[PDB]
């Protein structure tokens, strides 16, 4: 019943950098220090156990160090698939305790988004609603503005947005933005438009369609 603390607990590094998350226990933990890796929405995997030993199939660029209350994880080359949260666990005293995890994000070269718009399904309009969807796809950085103009007229707070986690093989993102308004108000407007603005895009992309007649 040792507090485990990791520092830092969010991190960005280009592919090929070394990385160092440290983990420090409130007590001499005697080298019973293991490191877990957990990909977004999976069980954690054991990389290193007993400060510096590797689990089977855990690649050489990962290593562990330390003693007493201080220990470190070092990935010596970031590879895009080291996108995970890593946790340290003490195995010295009951209960076993964990750190808060560190978030390693892979910093890479600007990708510009592929914008796509979907009109509302005739089925859904039958259920009394419409959900106009824009997909900004496979871009980088996570920062990109989206706005909805319904007949050349900015809309407000009637669009939620969702983002994916970073892609394992090529460190990019994807974002849905869904405007959603009733059948009655969809049916009383004509052009529907989605406006993306991002770093690697020299000018705002507008992706649009007709008919609030659907």
């Amino acid at each position: 019943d040792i507090q485990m603390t990791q520092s830092p607990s969010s991190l960005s590094a280009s592919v090929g950098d070394r990385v160092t998350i440290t983990c420090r226990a409130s007590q001499d933990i005697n080298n019973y220090l293991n490191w877990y890796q957990q990909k977004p929405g999976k069980a954690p995997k054991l990389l290193i156990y007993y400060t510096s030993t590797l689990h089977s199939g855990v690649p050489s660029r990962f290593s562990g160090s330390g003693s007493g209350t201080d220990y470190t994880l070092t990935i010596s080359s970031l590879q895009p698939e080291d996108f995970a949260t890593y946790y340290c666990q003490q195995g010295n005293t009951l209960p076993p305790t964990f750190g808060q995890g560190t978030k390693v994000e892979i910093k890479r070269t600007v990708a510009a988004p592929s914008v796509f718009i979907f009109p509302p399904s005739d089925e859904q309009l039958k259920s009394g609603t419409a959900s106009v969807v824009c997909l900004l796809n496979n871009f980088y950085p996570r920062e990109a503005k989206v706005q909805w103009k319904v007949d050349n007229a900015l809309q407000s707070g009637n669009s939620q947005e969702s983002v994916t986690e970073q892609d394992s093989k090529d460190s990019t993102y994807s974002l849905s933005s869904t405007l959603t308004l009733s059948k009655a108000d969809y049916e009383k407007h004509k052009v529907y438009a989605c406006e993306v603005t991002h770093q690697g895009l020299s000018s705002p992309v507008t992706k649009s369609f007709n008919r609030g007649e659907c």
Binding site: A43, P120, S162
Partner: protein, 220 residues
């Protein structure tokens, strides 16, 4: 090959009990210790309790040791955890994991969500691949999985054979109380009148399955 599969999770009104099982394959049960973890959504891993098959020895994390209890069924190779007087703070994913000083094989998880809400099955809708003009080189179609509660919704394209180009976004709790999610893939434009695209939605808390066809064009 070791399998730790856990189950039992789902919706619970506050005040109710739950019983999770953790089923084992591929090793002699009796030789390793079983432990239940918990991870509250977007947070740290917590420990909850431990059992030794061999003598039914049991450690219990004191914050939980009042309300949560552990059992093993030596014959059936199943670890269990009884959960009592669930408050909403215990909404989380629960993992079982094996071994003492480190857990080498872990489970897959089961989410217990404690909410006074009801369960609803989702209404899957097409995100219909609009005009091969705008969509030129690669088109993108998907399914809007609407209005469910509790989570999750699994989504698959083409009975698990379309695996590349798929993006299933995080679900948004909407205004509703109910969630909404989306899965989308990016196929070659070229392939639209040479193949059907089907999203397969399973939302297990209401064991709603639906396979939907996402076909061509859109508004009218």
């Amino acid at each position: 090959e070791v399998q730790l599969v856990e189950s039992g999770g789902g919706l619970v009104q506050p005040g109710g009990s739950l019983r999770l099982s953790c089923a084992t394959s591929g090793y002699t049960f009796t030789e390793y210790t079983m432990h239940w973890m918990r991870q509250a959504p977007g947070k740290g891993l917590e420990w909850v309790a431990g059992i030794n098959p061999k003598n039914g020895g049991t450690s219990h994390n004191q914050r939980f040791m009042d309300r949560f209890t552990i059992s093993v069924d030596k014959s059936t190779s199943t670890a269990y955890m009884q959960m009592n007087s669930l408050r909403a703070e215990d909404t989380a994913v629960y993992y079982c994991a094996r071994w003492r000083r480190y857990f080498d094989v872990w489970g897959q998880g089961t989410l217990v969500t404690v909410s006074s809400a009801s369960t609803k099955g989702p209404s899957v809708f097409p995100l219909a691949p609009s005009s091969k003009s705008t969509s030129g080189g690669t088109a993108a179609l998907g399914c809007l999985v609407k209005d469910y509660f509790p989570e999750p919704v699994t989504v698959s394209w083409n009975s698990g054979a379309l695996t590349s180009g798929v993006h299933t976004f995080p679900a948004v709790l909407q205004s509703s109380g109910l969630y909404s999610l989306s899965s989308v893939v990016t196929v070659p434009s070229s392939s639209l009148g040479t193949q059907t695209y089907i999203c397969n939605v399973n939302h297990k808390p209401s064991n709603t399955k639906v396979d939907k066809k996402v076909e061509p064009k859109s508004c009218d």
